[PDB]
């Protein structure tokens, strides 16, 4: 069965905290290892995972936390076009349990509903643009009020070949706010952020840097007086390395680099490194 590729299986493994860097967090019950299961052959494709979160470590369970959320997502593709330009994503997640109504109210029922269709906005090879709309509901209350309290999220992706030979993925994030200008707002920061990243192929190792800001507000600080230490990175840069295994596994390695070049790599302000494991067959 292993030799045959009739069944397509995907497994993803993630760790919320890794000891590799040597840095951790305050609470244990806020981080655990994760495994994602995906299967598809005939019927549609379904991913199942469980998420347990302990706001208090004492209220977290080593065997299995009674405060638990099931994570379920099923993806649908529809060939109403020559290409699979039509798709639907459905996500089901329950917050808490509704099996019992025992005193104390440690048991509670909140539902998270996700509906997100896939759309190919542009159907041309030279320039591709995509966008997906995701609608979320929570608790019983939002279901009762319906679309009124529904949270709406939209992500859009633009593929432009800057050098023609390589394609750049630019993602635009759309959130619904008041969307009204205010005198209390200086306008220093943009209401939307443009995040751009590209896959660079170096053997079996893929290099994918991303920038928080695709088009920076200014060319530089461009002041006649500069301070070496910046309070925080306005444009954050993350670099992913895809590492290959001869067995047939691929892992994504996270690295964070500061805007200012480091002559001394022996000492860095921040250290963010993470490993994601993907199995696809």
- Distance (Å, whole) CA 84 – CA 78: 6
Task: Give the pairing of strands 33-40 and 45-52.
Answer: antiparallel
- Give Cα 258 distance to the centre of its chain: 21
- Distance (Å, whole) CA 122 – CA 160: 12
Q: Which residues contact 60 (CB under 8 A, 6 or more apart)?
A: 28, 29, 52, 53, 54, 67
Instruction: Give the DSSP per-residue string, the chain.
Output: --S--SSEEEEEEEESS-TTT----S-GGG--EEEEEEEESSS-EEEEEEEE--SSGGG--TTT-SSEEEEEEEEEEE-SSSS--EEEEEEEEEEE--S---TTS---EEEEEEEEEEEES---SSSEEEEEEEEEE-TTHHHHHGGGG-EEEEEEEEEE-SSSSS-EEEEEEEE-------TT----S-SS-EEEE-PEEETTEEEEEEES-SS-SSSS---SS--SS-SS-SS-EEEEEEEE-TTS-EEEEEEEE-SS--S-TTS-S-----EEEEEE-
- Distance (Å, whole) CA 185 – CA 191: 11
Phi, psi dihedrals of residue 57, rounded to the nearest 5°: -60, -30
- The coordinates were experimentally obtained by NMR
- Distance (Å, whole) CA 220 – CA 128: 31
CB 16 within 8 A of CB 32: yes
Cα torsion 209, 211, 214, 217 to 10°: value is -150
* Residue in the structure block whose two tokens are 């994760």: 34
Phi, psi dihedrals of residue 30, rounded to the nearest 5°: -110, 0
Bridge partners of 160? 168
């Amino acid at each position: 069965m292993e030799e045959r590729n009739d069944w397509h299986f995907n497994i993803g493994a993630m760790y919320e905290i890794e000891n590799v860097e040597g840095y951790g967090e305050d609470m244990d019950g806020l981080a655990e290892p994760s495994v994602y299961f995906n299967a598809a052959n005939g019927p549609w494709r379904i991913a199942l995972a469980y998420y347990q979160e302990g706001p208090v470590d004492y209220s977290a369970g080593k065997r299995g936390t009674w405060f638990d959320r099931p994570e379920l997502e099923v993806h649908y593709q529809f060939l109403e076009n020559d290409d699979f330009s039509f798709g639907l994503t459905g996500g089901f997640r329950n917050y808490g349990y509704h099996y019992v109504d025992e005193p104390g109210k440690d048991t509670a029922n909140m539902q998270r509903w996700k509906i997100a269709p896939d759309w190919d906005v542009k159907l041309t090879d030279d320039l591709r643009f995509n966008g997906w709309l995701s609608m979320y509901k929570f608790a019983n209350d939002l279901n009762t009020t319906g679309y009124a309290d529904t949270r709406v999220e939209t992500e859009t992706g633009l593929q432009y070949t800057f050098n023609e030979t390589v394609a750049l993925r630019v993602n635009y994030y759309l959130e619904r706010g008041f969307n009204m200008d205010d005198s209390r707002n200086n306008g220093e920061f943009s209401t939307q952020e443009i995040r751009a990243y590209l896959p660079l192929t170096l053997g079996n190792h893929s290099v994918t840097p991303y920038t928080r800001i695709g088009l920076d507000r200014w060319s530089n600080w461009d002041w006649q007086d500069d301070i070496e230490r910046e309070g925080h990175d306005f444009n954050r840069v993350g670099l992913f390395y895809g590492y290959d295994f001869q067995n047939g596994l691929s892992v994504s390695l996270e690295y964070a680099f500061e805007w200012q070049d480091h002559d001394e790599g022996d000492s860095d302000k921040f250290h963010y490194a993470g490993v994601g494991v993907n199995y696809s067959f």
